[PDB]
Design a protein around this ligand. Sequence first.
Ligand SMILES: OC[C@H]1O[C@H](O[C@H]2[C@H](O)[C@@H](O)[C@@H](O)O[C@@H]2CO)[C@H](O)[C@@H](O)[C@@H]1O
Ligand SMILES: OC[C@H]1O[C@H](O[C@H]2[C@H](O)[C@@H](O)[C@@H](O)O[C@@H]2CO)[C@H](O)[C@@H](O)[C@@H]1O
Lengths: 436, 436
Amino acid sequence: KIEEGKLVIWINGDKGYNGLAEVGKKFEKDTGIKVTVEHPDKLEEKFPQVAATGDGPDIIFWAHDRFGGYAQSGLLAEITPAAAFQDKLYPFTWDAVRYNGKLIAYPIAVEALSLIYNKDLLPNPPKTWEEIPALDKELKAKGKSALMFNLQEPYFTWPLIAADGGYAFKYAAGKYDIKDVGVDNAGAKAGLTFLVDLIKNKHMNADTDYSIAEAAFNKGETAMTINGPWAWSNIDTSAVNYGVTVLPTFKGQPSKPFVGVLSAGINAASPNKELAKEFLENYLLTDEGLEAVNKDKPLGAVALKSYEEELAKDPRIAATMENAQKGEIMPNIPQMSAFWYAVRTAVINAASGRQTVDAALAAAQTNAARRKPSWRERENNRRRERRRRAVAAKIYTGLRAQGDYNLPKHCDNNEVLKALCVEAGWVVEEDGTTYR
Amino acid sequence: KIEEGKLVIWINGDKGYNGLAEVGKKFEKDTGIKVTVEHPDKLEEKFPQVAATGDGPDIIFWAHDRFGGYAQSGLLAEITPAAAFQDKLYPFTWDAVRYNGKLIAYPIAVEALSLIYNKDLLPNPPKTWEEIPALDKELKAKGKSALMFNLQEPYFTWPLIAADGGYAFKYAAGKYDIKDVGVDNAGAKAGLTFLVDLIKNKHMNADTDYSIAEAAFNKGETAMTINGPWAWSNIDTSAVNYGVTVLPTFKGQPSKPFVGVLSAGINAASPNKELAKEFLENYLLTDEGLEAVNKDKPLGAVALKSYEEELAKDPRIAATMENAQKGEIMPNIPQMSAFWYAVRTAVINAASGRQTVDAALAAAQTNAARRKPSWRERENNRRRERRRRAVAAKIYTGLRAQGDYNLPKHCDNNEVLKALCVEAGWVVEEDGTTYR
DNA sequence: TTCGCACGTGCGAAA
DNA sequence: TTCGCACGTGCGAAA
Ligand SMILES: OC[C@H]1O[C@H](O[C@H]2[C@H](O)[C@@H](O)[C@@H](O)O[C@@H]2CO)[C@H](O)[C@@H](O)[C@@H]1O
Ligand SMILES: OC[C@H]1O[C@H](O[C@H]2[C@H](O)[C@@H](O)[C@@H](O)O[C@@H]2CO)[C@H](O)[C@@H](O)[C@@H]1O
């Protein structure tokens, strides 16, 4: 739990938390506040559960697509810095991270997925998804493989599903039609059927995850992988001579990844609101603060106008943005979670053969639009059934008391119902069949 | 699923899976059989779910306490090693992997928790748990702390709980008594009360987990920690000059850590059983094989006598074994999982203040002693309640059909029963109050 | 051991 | 939207 005079941080484990801790130490020595950095599993899930009761960290670090839903359950609101602080940063970044006209986190970077290939096994990477299966055959003879990426999180598979026209939600009339989904359209069918085919033809495995894909590339067993800028520092420590390049096309159409803006939301239950902002704006949104974090794990296209002009000329960042221009920024609406859960179920079930591509995407189309029942709606159901059982319980209580039926020493209510049935002129069989 | 002619292995993320991968690479070089090593989260729980349907890996690596529950479910191949090979390992390691007379896993190493301390900060490690809060007072004056360890897994807190008399199950007459659970006795109460006292007096944090303590000791913010031999390699590459020593005493009695034998079991659904037995016997359980895994992450006191005579020359191993002699080998009985879940819930609830020490431990004793109903018993309950509902359903079906009781278009069963009551000479109030 | 009511939510109906 | 039966398991009783 929170407490005054301290600062705790929740960032994803694949991020530069150790470089984030190097500056929290620089903050501590300056004005006396100990800063600790923790990278918990499933932090984007634990936060909306615990912070309702006042728990959680002072600041949470996640991409912006969840954040509007976090704002909607009242976990942050109304963050305002001065314009000197509002403009040492990019206008598109603020737009994504503002829910209903209110800034809800400090944007920290811009991330997109790109194709990462080893120049040693693949001097010329493939430009198209369609030549991938033939490539894997040439590399399977040498003992290696073509492509391995995270098939568990749909973030990595969406560039291919969207390539031929699948869309999460449609933007029209200055608004996201939170009903209109395009996970069941013919475009999504072409994308997923190709991915499932890659698995059916043994070019990829349906159980592949992050560690499985990251290890196969860093050890040189797989020519290409699909990852974000955070994965670069790990490939740097390995003996792999890699290049970052545009993701391959599918049916002459580009791959369209979902672009994420890493953001720091201040917990509305924190007591360190201003102290945390002291960390945010004055000690880590500086050149030297982003350096310490980027040296550990590359943030990607950082959003600080000052620091980014140094990073934008790294050819790896330039390729990361060639992929992002081809993609779309992620909606921050609360129904992102329902869409992300549904498509995750679709890919996993279609990759494993539990469902057809038709059945998985059709089920995902309805799940991504499903409404979560309110707390009041749940309690209304609970209370109504609680009343029902109470009404029946009182009735049978009186029948067992004053009925004086010929009942066994112990018997369920159905026996009482039967005995009271025959008194009214009915005959009840063994299985409950009743008549006059 | 597992393919014929391939080997896939599951080991915990804190072990040297990269070292184990190099052993598989040599196995691939001599027999042409690819070996893939994965470290998925919650593998101790994932395995009994997938392996029942014939899925899971070929070989699973875990401490020996979980294997008996696996074997009772028929998930493991029975280990058939030559008598000549069984003599190559310490006999008591074979005992940890014996269940119902059969051998069910290949014992790899012996693991016991020890006190790891920073020699530069604390040259003389405290010999007693009770003197630790005083050590923290001196330490807080430097901005440091004394002790930090994983508070989320009961494996780390148990040596304190067991010191003054707590135990899991009592051994008597050649078997463990699953109904004699000692997580509620006075010794276990005092041990946990002390730990909760450390948290109440701000000498330790209840949210502390593995990565938080491992990061803080390696970064030199705490002078002591509690961890097994696997954690040394990260400290080695760190700047801390460290020593491994016996765990401190509590009320004059030593801490009694549960001793675990890292073991490799063979999935019963594996068409590569002969291949898995070959890889474990002639490539891993050798000097060169265990050395490769050990150089990655220290295994501890290996079961193989030939390589252990070399590893025993290590003062850190002779200290790890000094703690082991004061502790106990875990049971491998299937109830161990239920004991681990109960104590895990208790320590977390007590460390957080959600429950008292007396309430949490009393609930842990009933949970760890609760008899898990068999599948058939669960099914019996499900069918009996299904039959009870169908009987009531047929009665209300016939009442609605031949009653003509003069009720609305739609109405619940309670109203039909109400209408039948008045037909038989009763009256029913709104809340169900019923009499003649 | 079996047994039966309680419990909160699922699923779809009826509107 | 509210509604109501079905669902499988919890808890405790009776033995
Ligand atoms: O898989 C759904 C998941 O996708 C995105 O998560 C990314 C995240 O943006 C990256 O920073 C990194 O952590 O990889 C993640 C995928 O594993 C969305 O941001 C997230 O909301 C969504 O759940
Ligand atoms: O915390 C309960 C846990 O204790 C043991 O797990 C140990 C394991 O023996 C070590 O190899 C290492 O991984 O630390 C683990 C605890 O985090 C038991 O073996 C395990 O069954 C139990 O769940």
